[PDB]
Amino acid sequence: KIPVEADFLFAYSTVPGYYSWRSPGRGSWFVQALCSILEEHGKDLEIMQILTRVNDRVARHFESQSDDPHFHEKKQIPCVVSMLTKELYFSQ
Amino acid sequence: KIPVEADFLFAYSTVPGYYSWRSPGRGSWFVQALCSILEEHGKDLEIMQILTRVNDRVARHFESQSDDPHFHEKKQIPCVVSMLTKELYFSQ
Amino acid sequence: QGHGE
Amino acid sequence: DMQX
Amino acid sequence: DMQX
Amino acid sequence: TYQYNMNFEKLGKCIIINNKNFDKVTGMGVRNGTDKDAEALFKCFRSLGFDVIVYNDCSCAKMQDLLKKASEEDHTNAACFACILLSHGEENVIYGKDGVTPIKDLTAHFRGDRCKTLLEKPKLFFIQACRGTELDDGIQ
Amino acid sequence: TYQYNMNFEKLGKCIIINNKNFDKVTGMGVRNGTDKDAEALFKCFRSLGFDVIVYNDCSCAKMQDLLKKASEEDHTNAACFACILLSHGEENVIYGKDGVTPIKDLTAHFRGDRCKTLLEKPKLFFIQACRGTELDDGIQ
Helix, strand or coil, X not given: CECCCCXXXXXXXXXXXXXXXXECCCEEHHHHHHHHXXXXXXXXXXXXXXXXXXXXXXXXXXXXXXXXHHHCCCECCCEEEECCCCECCCCC | CECCCCCEEEEECCCCCECCEEECCCEEHHHHHHHHHHHHHCCCCCHHHHHHHHHHHXXXXXXXXXXXXXXXXXXXXXXXXXXXXXXXXXXX | CXXXX | CEXX | CXXX | CCECCCCCCEEEEEEEXXXXXXXXXXXXXXXXXXXXXXHHHHXXXXXXXXXXXXEECCCHHHHHHHXXXXXXXXXXXXXXXXXXXXXXXXXXXXXXXXXXXXXXXXXXXXXXXXXXXXXXXXEEEEEECCCCCECECCEC | CCECCCCCCEEEEEEEEECCCCCHHHCCCCCCCHHHHHHHHHHHHHHHCEXXXXXXXXXXXXXXXXXXXXXXXXXXXXXXXEEEEECCEXXXXXXXXXXXXXXXXXXXXXXXXXXXXXXCCCXXXXXXXXXXXXXXCCEC
């Protein structure tokens, strides 16, 4: 007998109550990052290790640019919610 | 610059909108599990590996018992929320 | 696999 | 058991 | 940049 | 042991909902750049081994049905499931082209008691969407 | 490097709030078994290298103030911060003997812009409390 809510993983692009950024010419921050890490370690790293490197890349390599002083130089941090019960690897 | 909401980790005993179980004689399920896993691996495993094993132990090892049919044989699954940007080890 | 520090 |  |  | 069993003939199904244009009544703007995201995501998840399909400018009903039907398929030979949502959004909700729907309802279709074939298997959801209007000004 | 730097004079502080008794007006009951939890937790975290401090039956005001002052302390020589909350709770909030307070406001004290000394350092919060009244019936 296992919890009906078990084994779910939500990888949100941002934390609760916050905005999520997207550069119109390159795509959203969260996805650019997610893909870089995945095409590079999607098959050799555990999911949480991957999503953690994604949080870091988003938080470090991005900063909003806008002619609107209010939305100028803002930052972002993704949010991973895991109800997983084992380690996850996309291989073998 | 770095995100103000970055580097936080919230290990919740249960998922949004649900109850959390506690045995008057042995303590809450989440706490029992957390300690049990930390004693064995708190110094050789990464924080997410630990919490994931905690999810698994709470999910498989516990089932509620109550004289009130409405509250017996119920299950539970913890919820980990990570804004961490690196892997965390308590040793070294 | 094996998590390696 | 009980609920928190 | 835009918001979502 | 401590890892999910990936020994299945199929890695799993992957749904990508790519919402770019919204009904004028919603007041939401065109999400330019979301096409690069969806194409990039497509290649990545394909490389992992997922059988991915992309749906564009879905209505709340479409999204709901899309996921309900997916949860009703037979995942006996799949290792897991994955869904990616790209859109406008607010706290706990996500936009369709016609309005908003609870993320909760999109996902609860895969609960262990509502999708026996994905029981004990990982259900993954990647959500690119706002969750409010707070700004993170950062710090050095 | 892909790991948090743990080369600090000390591992850090671990604050434990063990709320067992609540004012009658809250409708909350005695949380029997919470002392065992606090005991086991404290022995466990001290063993990890944390400077553990245990507070009991705290008002909402006490919890806020207690965590605010902790965020104003100097953490320069610590690798991280840890806080454990043992009490009654409802979605997004936790109970003091006083009543209810937002978990977001408690943890906000340690944001990178309001606690420079813990910047780039992990901030852990373990929470044993309810988050609603839904029951998980299970399956299999």
